[PDB]
Design goal:
Chains A, D: Its main location: cytoplasm. Chains A, D: One of its GO terms (biological process) is spliceosomal snRNP assembly. The structure is cut from a larger assembly and holds three copies of chain A, one copy of chain B (4 residues) and three copies of chain C (6 residues). Chain A has 15 helices and 26 strands. Chain A has 609 residues and is an alpha/beta fold. Chain A has three domains: 3-284, TIM Barrel, CATH 3.20.20; 296-439, Rossmann fold (3-Layer(aba) Sandwich); 442-608, Hnrnp arginine n-methyltransferase1. The radius of gyration of chain A is 30 Å and the shape is elongated. Chain B is low in regular secondary structure. In chain B, 0% of the residues lie in helices and 0% in strands. Chain C is largely without helices or strands. The chains are: A alpha/beta (609), B little secondary structure (4), C little secondary structure (6). Chains in contact: A-B, A-C, A-D, A-E, D-E, D-F, E-G. At the A-E interface, helix 2, helix 3, helix 10 and helix 13 of A face helix 2, helix 3, helix 10 and helix 13 of E. The structure holds adenosine (3 copies). One adenosine binds at residues 289-290, 339-340, 342, 366-369, 372, 394-396, 410-411, 419, 424 of chain D. The site of one adenosine has 16 residues of chain E, from loops.
């Protein structure tokens, strides 16, 4: 855990950094100007106030300023005041403080969102961002609960929980979803419901702000947190936010190291996650193994998965037990064709499956990649021998010497058919015996609507020259989605079964009942596949095969985000389209508000046949 | 110390 | 690249 | 009136086109395939039906096909059928018919919008538009009233007015607001309210469909129309749509020339409109006289407005009468300073005013344009003489030899301050006497929210290379908006008064109560100006100075349209921003949903000081 | 030094890689297919040859392939053969070998440029680069001396552009391939070296490796590999570029092991200033010229200014000399010299003025004008804590400030890499009305210098500076502050623009550069010299460079299309310093030997904001 | 160009 | 940034 101390009083700054680093904090949120030093910018004599306006640069080194200090905007700066003089002084002072922080090169700046209307603050911030070159992040300091909702019931004659999120949403929408504007969330004593926290966790939260007043004390007098607070801390610790501790020491008998020590205690109290580490919210282009040739280092991460090939070997083992009785155990030889044999792993899985099933197989390893044919043929010379026949041909062009009993393939993508498993297996179906088996015999794709401001900003950041400016929103992305909110349960899109003894063009309509209020940002695509009868591989988040990491989910973005209310069903439509030369997907949201069909004619993304 |  | 992505 | 005949039965095509032309119709809407000749594309034996599928190309000349025939889709083609075989056959047949119409080079093609779900139709159309090169227009045939609401109440045991507009809106949103997809509106017997007709009038209506069944019968027997229908025909004739007559001749005693002759009769019974003709929905860019030197033709366009210069002359007349009493007539010389003298129509207005007021003036004609100074100095040498002193300087940097009693300028734009009248008159008020007058005395800008889908497509079509791909939405456009819908009444944005004796930066928040469900597309800006006491020039659509075409409205687009419903209030913020170098505008919609702030730091549009 | 071993015989890949890394090499250049295993691709029966075509990719780890192996094209592959059958087979086999190297993820691939016509080689490589995704670099193996010019004179009836031949080969190859980033040079150094200007043209090229046969090594009195002094000088020049040295051939000194050829190169690497230490990490790295007038600099930007002590030593010495000159020793204690430091920064030039007046024992009343409101904070904390009433800190622009009195000396620090690209003339123009009529400006004068350069790497860096949402070729119309390192300078610098203070700042210069080599012009490098006071100068011109003074890198003005120049052909360039009330910019155009367009018309791609 | 526009 | 460059 990495954490900081928010101080509003820094009498001398080097002493304060010393006293803050001794007690374990990693940065310090401090005001660059004096919080009570109101400046005047328009009227004399106070406009011409002499002397320095703030502290010198030279009190800390450049590395100290760039790494250790998070600036704060002064509390009197009120750019959305109803008084025009206060409003203009606050615009000028906000610009002065932001420019001084840019000059100091602070890594972050902390600005407050403590009311509904922050339009002028948004304009001054978005004009600072587009002026000059600077690299500060802007952590907008927004609470979980509005300050007028957690006040005591003391006054005798005087959107409830979705309120401050709408403050933040309006702010980040006025600033046009800037990459440099994020959230510093204040966690008070009164936590909101669970679905409010999910929207909050789908946002750009770089910091969490924990007052020392929300800490409750134990029998020994230390600061601890309630179980609901601890659960919120664990969810935030999954996002790797930093924790800012504000307020005074409410447990005076101890010292201020105790709050931080409790946070580290919860930090230590907190294979797919290890593999996916470093790839979270990192967009990738989906593989196209039919139109491109894969590097050996691409095949290595395939063969790094033991669960998928163990499941394939189990499916082949059960199929070989079914197709050959114990009486015909030796005089019956089953023809297997591994289609797209890769560098070996399905051929080895088939050999092991026939070895543990105690059945005889004649195996063909078909592979179009000549560079993988090199390693397949070295395997064949060195290990496999005459049992395996290595074919350097496309399965759709190959002329088989004899028909097959089982054809086994691994041509499934993250959305189960974006790597042309239907077309390839339909081409390879003619050398299958009339009672032959295809492994996998079944696969379905699943879609769920998601919200993620970070994923949307990465998709925008994928905008490239020499290209349509919104082609990036018409491409699926293989992404280990991490900082997102899923709006509804997944629901099956497309189903393909092999062999097909009957058109791979598909049209699906999916209605997702959204029981909460959200802002739809895209769709996540998963898949399930039945290899043989009860052997399945799934990346669906409720049926996910444990320990399997060969497939990250697919993201289908949408060009503009769609604001969704509670009780509003999201109706989306997906097409699997094709021609003689290429296959693509088209999608469109039709309810609650329509969007354009994304990727028409495959103009931004096709899969090459 | 860390006990709830 | 990992998870069937380039 | 350009009008067409919609036939669904064409036995011979040349004879029918001849008869249609004899009746007086300009085009003919006809089915390219036989409407009853349903075709199979998937199942044998009917997939292999021999012979020609339709008529020959050679039955009409090429120019006949490209100028005379509007194609129709066959009525059995339902791409959004719930039966998969029907909808796949209908996708294939719709593709076949659209490709045959593209091959025939038809100018237009009618497709029906007669049900709520038209997503697969939209996808097949969007894929046709993006496949191949072809330039036919697609007229989506949508009714004013849905057919389930026009049915008689004769069944014993068995959103109202805004249904089919939402059909059209969903369709055009799925197809991404294409320039090639427009509306053919069916006007039935029962006619909707006035505000339904206003959204419809804001749409790309290229044709209007008048069934012969909606025509009333007079005492002589000829077809006529109701008063509400006549009003709708007049509002559509303002848009220059083509009227399509459908159905059979219900007035069998008369010919079918009578339905056309009534429309010709209404056509022959329907200065600013003559000037603005040919400029409707044509986006210029606002002039910048301070940063760019104008042309002779620009000034000539200015000086063809007699109303504005008559108004300036009346203002100077009244000011000269006020500032000099009759007894001090021959001894008091009033220093007038014409700032930005142009080629000299304001100087002539001042001289004619001083003659009409019968007062003695010493006039200065300041002009920074070195090429209009040539015209001014030839005027001075020939006509004006020593009364007028021509200064070739900026009014801001010019050092006067005396103070001015009156300063007169024409520095106003379509938004009253986008040509930097405040900054120019600010630097030109130090050579004004302490009781000096400025004409114009003050000026206000007014904003109204508008919907116009054609204007949104025009702004999209302004996407220029080698710049931000969405920087065309952050520029005001001088536009004679014609095909639009004004959502609410104009409200004042910014007011500047001269002389300023007390910052030209401004901030306005305008809340527009909308009483109708609409889709906000931009903000139209007008201005009013008080030259002298009761002398005003206005381009506001209610207080417009009659026949005064100096200024078109200004248009501030928004990047994505904002859907609005009844009872909501559109809240928008407008900022006038400046620095030492530049002046610009920033805008953002804050209610009902937020938009981004448009033009931050003047990144897409500044006015040069 | 990083060094590799070129082997054309790898009987076992793991054993050979172990033995190569045992004796100190960092990579191994080896054939991925057997060099003699000629494959057939068109004609039967040899087209249908069975078995693996090459050895497996599972013999080394993936990281071993990605870091330790440089692949070689097979010697029989001649894609430019005059026989069509050999040409087609060699195209197919080139593609197969390149694709297998991409499959292996090799970091580099060696291809030979051993003949004049390599157009089909260039086409097959250009098509490989534009196909699929792969990251391998392509090292074109080109000799320093052509193979037909190294042969012995032992043919009785065939006795033996001579030196500029293989560079012409490489130039044609990389011009056909459109100056790819992924295509570089592996230079073969032979026994007989060419002239020194031939070696300069090569040193301005993307050389990523140097190939040293063991046959170019001489022998000691103790019997060890060594190289001649002309070879050692070539090695020392190549060590500046940080190339990798590839040892080819067999052990020609068989008494000692093959480690000795490597040990000599390690010896020479261990036997080859502060500017070079400061400039590391910044060589051939384009960055934008600073614009302090219209951009407020950060504090870390000022920190690297104050990190140069030589510039401020020189300013203090100039103020010292001026103070002695303007005040006689008899009038020492009663004359107050009003100094004005214009653009005072965060302090260092005011500190130089104070130290100068202390060592001159003179009395000064100093004004520190600065428009940066965030550096005024530093200046005013300086004044409160140290300076006191001697220094008056002004938060204004020198051009609009109203001084309470006139100055004796104005001192400014407004010089860029090209001496006027930061509007020092325009700023000091508006700061002359508060200078006394005998008043002195420091710097007194400054001149900019230009020299024509050649650099393929700089040209590719400028192309890589293309941005979206702007003119696709505007990157060639901006100057770049660059520690230009991998470049060839075609002629001596000549003075471009001179400004002198106190004094139209629009300028027009024509410079004719005599060329004595046969190169391709890529841009002009601009330097400056400034006279602060009498004999106190600051210069970044590479002949008169102030020692250890790293405040300024050279400026670079590119040209959109390279201009091929031959010997005895002067290059005539013309520079304009243009301006209006709002902006100042530069325009340039080469007019001889071949005209180019005027670069940056109206400042459409680059202006300096007033 | 008409209406104060180019 | 060094050598008067950003
Ligand atoms: N049509 C095909 N014929 C043979 N191998 C294929 C085909 N399509 C994909 N593959 C291979 O299938 C494996 C998994 O996608 C990869 O090795 C890929 O090269
Ligand atoms: N600062 C200025 N000084 C003089 N004429 C001006 C100035 N700004 C605009 N104009 C002139 O005003 C007229 C209308 O804007 C034009 O003739 C234009 O050239
Ligand atoms: N016109 C100006 N007036 C005052 N300081 C300036 C001016 N132009 C540049 N400077 C300052 O000069 C220094 C250039 O190194 C910077 O501190 C910069 O802020």
């Amino acid at each position: 855990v990495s954490s900081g101390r928010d101080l509003n009083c820094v009498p001398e700054i080097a002493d304060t950094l010393g006293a803050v680093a001794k007690q374990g904090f990693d940065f310090l949120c401090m005001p660059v100007f004096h919080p009570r030093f109101k400046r005047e910018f328009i009227q004399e004599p106070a406009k011409n106030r002499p002397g320095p306006q703030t502290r010198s640069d030279l009190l800390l080194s450049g590395r100290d300023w760039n790494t250790l200090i998070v600036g704060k905007l002064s509390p009197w700066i009120r750019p959305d005041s109803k008084v025009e003089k206060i409003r203009r002084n606050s615009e000028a002072a906000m610009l002065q403080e932001l420019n001084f922080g840019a000059y100091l090169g602070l890594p972050a700046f902390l600005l407050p969102l403590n009311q509904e209307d922050n339009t002028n603050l948004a304009r001054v911030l978005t004009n600072h961002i587009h002026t000059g070159h600077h690299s500060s992040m802007f952590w907008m300091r927004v609470p979980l609960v509005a300050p007028e909702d957690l006040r005591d019931d003391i006054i005798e004659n005087a959107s409830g929980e979705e309120k401050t999120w709408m403050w933040w949403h309006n702010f980040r929408t006025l600033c046009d979803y800037s990459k440099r504007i994020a959230v510093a969330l204040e966690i008070g004593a009164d936590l909101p419901s669970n679905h409010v926290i999910d929207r909050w966790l789908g946002e750009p939260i770089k910091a969490a702000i924990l007052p020392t007043s929300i800490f409750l004390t134990n029998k020994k007098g230390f600061p601890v947190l309630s179980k609901m607070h601890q659960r919120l801390i664990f969810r935030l610790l999954k996002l790797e936010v930093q924790f800012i501790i504000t307020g005074t020491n409410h447990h005076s008998e101890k010292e201020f190291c105790s709050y931080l020590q409790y946070l580290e205690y919860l930090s230590q109290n907190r294979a797919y996650e290890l593999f996916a580490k470093g790839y979270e919210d990192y967009l990738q282009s989906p593989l196209q193994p039919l139109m491109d040739n894969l590097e050996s280092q691409t095949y290595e991460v395939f063969e790094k998965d033991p669960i998928k090939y163990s499941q394939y070997q189990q499916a082949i083992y059960k199929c070989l037990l079914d197709r050959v009785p114990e009486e015909e155990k030796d005089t019956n030889v089953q023809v297997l064709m591994v289609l797209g044999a890769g560098r070996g792993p399905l051929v080895n899985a088939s050999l092991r499956a026939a070895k543990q099933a105690d059945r005889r197989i004649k195996l063909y390893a078909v592979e179009k990649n000549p560079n993988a044919v090199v390693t397949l043929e070295n395997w064949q010379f060195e290990e496999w021998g005459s049992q395996v026949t290595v074919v350097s041909s496309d399965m759709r062009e190959w002329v088989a010497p004899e028909k097959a009993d089982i054809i086994v393939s691994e041509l499934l993508g993250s959305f189960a058919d974006n790597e042309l498993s239907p077309e390839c297996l339909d081409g390879a179906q003619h050398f299958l015996k009339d009672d032959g088996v295809s492994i996998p015999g079944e696969y379905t794709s699943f879609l769920a609507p998601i919200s993620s401001s970070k994923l949307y900003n990465e998709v925008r950041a994928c905008r490239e020259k020499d290209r349509d400016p919104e082609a990036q929103f018409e491409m699926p992305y293989v992404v280990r989605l991490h900082n997102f909110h899923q709006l509804s349960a997944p629901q099956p899109c497309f189903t393909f079964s092999h062999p097909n003894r009957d058109d791979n063009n598909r049209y699906c309509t999916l209605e997702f009942p959204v029981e909460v209020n959200t802002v739809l940002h895209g769709f996540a695509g998963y898949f399930e596949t039945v290899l043989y009868q009860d052997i399945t591989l799934s990346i669906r988040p409720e049926t996910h095969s444990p320990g399997m990491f060969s497939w990250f989910p697919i993201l289908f973005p949408i060009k503009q985000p769609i604001t969704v209310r509670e009780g509003q069903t999201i109706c989306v439509r997906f097409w699997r389209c094709s021609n003689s030369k290429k296959v693509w997907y088209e999608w469109a949201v039709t309810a609650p508000v329509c969007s354009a069909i994304h990727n028409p004619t495959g103009r931004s993304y096709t899969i090459g046949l | 110390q860390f006990e709830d | 690249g990992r998870g069937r992505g380039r």
